[PDB]
Symmetry: C5
Subunit: 206 residues, 5 copies
Amino acid sequence: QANLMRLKSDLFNRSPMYPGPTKDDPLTVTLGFTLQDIVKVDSSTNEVDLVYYEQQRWKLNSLMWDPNEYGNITDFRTSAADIWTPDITAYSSTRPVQVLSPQIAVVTHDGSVMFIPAQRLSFMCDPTGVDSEEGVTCAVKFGSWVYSGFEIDLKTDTDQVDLSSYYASSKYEILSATQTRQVQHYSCCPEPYIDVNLVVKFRERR
Amino acid sequence: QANLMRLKSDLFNRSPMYPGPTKDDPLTVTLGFTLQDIVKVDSSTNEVDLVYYEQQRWKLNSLMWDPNEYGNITDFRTSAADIWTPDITAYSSTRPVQVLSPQIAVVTHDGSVMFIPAQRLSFMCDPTGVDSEEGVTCAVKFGSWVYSGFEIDLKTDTDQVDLSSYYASSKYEILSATQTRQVQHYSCCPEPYIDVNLVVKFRER
Amino acid sequence: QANLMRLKSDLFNRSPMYPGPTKDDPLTVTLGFTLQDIVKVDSSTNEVDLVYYEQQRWKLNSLMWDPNEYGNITDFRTSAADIWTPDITAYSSTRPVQVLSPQIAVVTHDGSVMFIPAQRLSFMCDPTGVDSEEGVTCAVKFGSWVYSGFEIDLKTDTDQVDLSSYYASSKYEILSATQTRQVQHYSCCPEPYIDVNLVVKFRERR
Amino acid sequence: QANLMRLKSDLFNRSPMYPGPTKDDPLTVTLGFTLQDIVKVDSSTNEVDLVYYEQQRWKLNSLMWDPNEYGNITDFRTSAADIWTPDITAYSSTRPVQVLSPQIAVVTHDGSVMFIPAQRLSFMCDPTGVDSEEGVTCAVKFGSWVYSGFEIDLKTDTDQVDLSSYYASSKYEILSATQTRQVQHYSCCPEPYIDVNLVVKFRER
Amino acid sequence: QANLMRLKSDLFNRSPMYPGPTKDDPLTVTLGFTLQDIVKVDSSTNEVDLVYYEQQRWKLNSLMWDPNEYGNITDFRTSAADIWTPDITAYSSTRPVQVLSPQIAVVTHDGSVMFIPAQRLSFMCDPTGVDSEEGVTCAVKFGSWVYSGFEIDLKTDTDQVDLSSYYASSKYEILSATQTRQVQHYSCCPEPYIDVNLVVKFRER
Ligand SMILES: *[C@@H]1O[C@H](CO)[C@@H](O[C@@H]2O[C@H](CO)[C@@H](O)[C@H](O)[C@H]2NC(C)=O)[C@H](O)[C@H]1NC(C)=O
Ligand SMILES: *[C@@H]1O[C@H](CO)[C@@H](O[C@@H]2O[C@H](CO)[C@@H](O)[C@H](O)[C@H]2NC(C)=O)[C@H](O)[C@H]1NC(C)=O
Ligand SMILES: O=C1C[C@@H]2OCC=C3CN4CC[C@]56c7ccccc7N1[C@H]5[C@H]2[C@H]3C[C@H]46
Ligand SMILES: O=C1C[C@@H]2OCC=C3CN4CC[C@]56c7ccccc7N1[C@H]5[C@H]2[C@H]3C[C@H]46
Ligand SMILES: O=C1C[C@@H]2OCC=C3CN4CC[C@]56c7ccccc7N1[C@H]5[C@H]2[C@H]3C[C@H]46
Ligand SMILES: O=C1C[C@@H]2OCC=C3CN4CC[C@]56c7ccccc7N1[C@H]5[C@H]2[C@H]3C[C@H]46
Ligand SMILES: O=C1C[C@@H]2OCC=C3CN4CC[C@]56c7ccccc7N1[C@H]5[C@H]2[C@H]3C[C@H]46
Ligand SMILES: *[C@@H]1O[C@H](CO)[C@@H](O)[C@H](O)[C@H]1NC(C)=O
């Protein structure tokens, strides 16, 4: 209690919040998806709804401490409002993303942060052929809304979407689900933009 | 008024809020459900909606006081924003949980806290067989979102879900409802996670 | 303007907010309902939606003042956030209550407060038989969420729900509407809890 | 920039917000509606949905300044949170009113304020006869929620609702739309209440 | 980190926020739309839903800095709450606009700001004829809610709406989409108001 209180006071009250990365001091953010459910499909609007956990990890020098100086504390939990978080956004959502979990992050003594919001997302997807044996493929890109590849580098720990928590009695079964880093250039602008392309192949079950 | 004002000032203004548990100083949180209604079932999306009260109890040394020092006050009510509260979350919700009651907790002189949010929850459930006599069983786990079993231990006072306030004219009748502590390990994570599994067997009326 | 500004400053900035009642210093809260409309019925979910005004009144010594000391002001209006308000809640709602009026209360020099939120409420009600001549009866209890009868006493000024503002062209006509104080005990806990039971008998029009 | 910053600092940081009117110092608020669209009708619930702009004007001595003292500034725009605003409310809404415009007001050197929220409103209305040539008439009163006629006087600049921005391809055409000051007493209350009654006659194509 | 922290502290903590433009010091805001999808059409209410990115650009002297003084930083990203933003609003929305992107802007050393909110908008549109080969045309104006043309000038970089990100498998195909500056006068008021008129011609695929 007392040690943790002192640590949080030192990290958060005695210094300003991290202002985000720059060209000079870029930040790597790792993303991974855990797909829980394809909740619904809307063939009249071509919108599909997913529920997933989006794991985000990054590391800041300003969040480092020595466990010996603070009662051997190697990590703690704190409100996501206490710290900077990356602006990772679905590019083709049709509704505001709905948050299903509390906004709390885990901070480790090496300055690494793990933040894993559960979300429900409606996104642009033609579900025609979902009732067939081949099923249907849909895709949605996630990236920083305003940081280029010079400020934020996105990576994945794996190209496989974690399906170990997928709901066994969903209306839809997953045939494949991948998460792939893409570099993108746009005609206006010189700098590269990074996204992770979440590609899901699915169909109605049996 | 004056005594209570002084107590709240001492507990909340004159010291920092409890920062949450650690490996060294873990916290036990007791959970209990009162199921009020199965409001609806959606066979096109496999989502079911429940209304329930979720009682949460825990105890902190930092919330202790001597009643004699504060006008014989043995307990008080306060906004949940004034205190730390646990991050207990349904694992398989499909919509943000909707809160139906005001966010107020009861604090007792021994440092124990009782907080009982009424909630409406949409969660993943295949309702196939709800129209049958056998009915259907659905389950949803509740636990801390980011604290492991090393920091937060969950328990129940009983394995029976309180059904005494269940809505008599619901579209669905309850055949059974249980609440059971589970210890879980994951491929992701080395540390154990504790949840309470709410299992409800029901059918159409 | 100047006198009222000074009064509000004295009551709200120069002292802490009332911390709520206790066993030693209980508070009586008077409730009355004005039923405006039965807006809808849902026979697939057994939910009914009402629109009403819920008048709440109570009195605090801490909100007293002498009109002579403050430019002859006998009352004022203020945001409900400036003052303590009771945690009166429907026991059997199925959705969060929707507030239709601004959150403003009237405070009188004797310390009495009048707060009258207009609300739309979805609550548990089987509407089977609403299309019949006998109609249907539904009920919903309102009480403090966490204060017992030792801290908050609820009363009504009358057992009749005010129907003078009921919408003349509603889909549903009201046969009766009553509001009755009840004392209740629950198996766990020694202390009594007070509620007001709103009972409404209605049917389809004409 | 610099002059305006100084003016806002003098008006808002150097003095308290206006606390609202009293019996001794009543306030006149002028209302006017611009009806944009009758968006929908629900004959199963007797709810109708309108989109309109509600112009509100009032004048306070505390918001006066001399333009010469502040770089010739005769008016400025500011967040509605910086100032007091009246609690004008539809009496027969069935859903919380939805705000479609940013909450910003215009303040003029004579202390006059203009605030014009665009809103979508669902209100109690039987639409039976909307498909006929005569159409249907519906009405909704707007007034202060908690100030009586002793504290706030409402007026209109005109009895005609502005229809110049009405959506030409709406599902519903407007036959007439009026806005009329009414004085009212209630069984509850000794003091008179002022409202503006918005009466709209409309029909399908 | 350290240089950027100092820059933000200098710009945002050590001086007041920009209070908005005046007649004396007007501001030009450039708008451009990127239409992503016509998501739905409602022929029972004459409402259509679009998803788009609205790029907004303006320039303030108060946001200028010398890169040499701050570690060669030529630009940074910051929360839109840290800075003033224009009150650009759709004139004919039927629901509050839904924001799909985080509220973050890019600020450049010359004081220029780029802010690009992704939005879902329901607006007044008769979709009769959408199933035909000619299709249907709908329009919606965007402008400042309370600043006139004397305080805020709107312009476009181009009259063509960017369709390069339009969703290939939308139910609706775009025949044309234009964005055009308009000057407007209103009977009440002496001052001109500027808007950008977004005109979209589309049909079923
Ligand atoms: C924090 O942890 C370190 C070890 O992980 C502790 O340091 C050791 O304490 C043991 C047991 O008393 C000694 O025998 C070792 O010599 C110490 N050093 C090392 C490097 O192992 C330390 O005492 C812990 N601190 C607290 C307050 O619990
Ligand atoms: C409060 O009320 C008293 C009277 O009840 C006001 O004082 C009187 O003011 C009138 C003019 O309005 C004078 O002619 C009287 O001589 C005053 N009498 C006394 C005893 O003071 C007083 O002005 C009121 N306060 C206000 C309006 O702020
Ligand atoms: O030109 C583009 C299109 C592209 O759209 C998909 C979403 C993206 C997320 N943000 C939103 C704005 C954007 C951007 C920034 C700077 C120049 C061009 C540009 N955009 C989008 C772009 C990506 C990346 C970035
Ligand atoms: O990927 C998972 C699966 C599992 O999901 C059920 C809920 C859990 C409670 N919290 C939420 C995040 C989670 C966790 C932490 C770190 C990596 C992966 C991960 N999760 C969930 C997990 C448990 C434990 C933990
Ligand atoms: O045990 C209960 C059930 C009962 O539910 C109906 C509604 C009530 C209003 N509040 C909500 C919490 C509650 C309460 C307080 C303390 C211990 C148990 C307890 N609850 C509910 C109770 C009443 C009274 C009170
Ligand atoms: O009983 C009523 C009905 C009537 O409703 C129309 C609107 C009004 C404006 N405010 C809102 C609350 C109200 C009022 C005050 C005290 C007791 C009952 C009561 N109401 C409304 C009333 C008027 C006047 C007042
Ligand atoms: O008289 C009007 C109608 C017109 O409506 C289209 C939208 C507009 C954008 N803002 C919103 C308020 C408004 C305006 C300013 C001052 C008095 C009246 C008034 N309005 C609207 C007007 C334009 C311009 C401006
Ligand atoms: C900034 O640019 C100058 C000029 O090239 C260079 O000398 C300096 O090292 C750069 N970096 C910093 C942090 O000032």
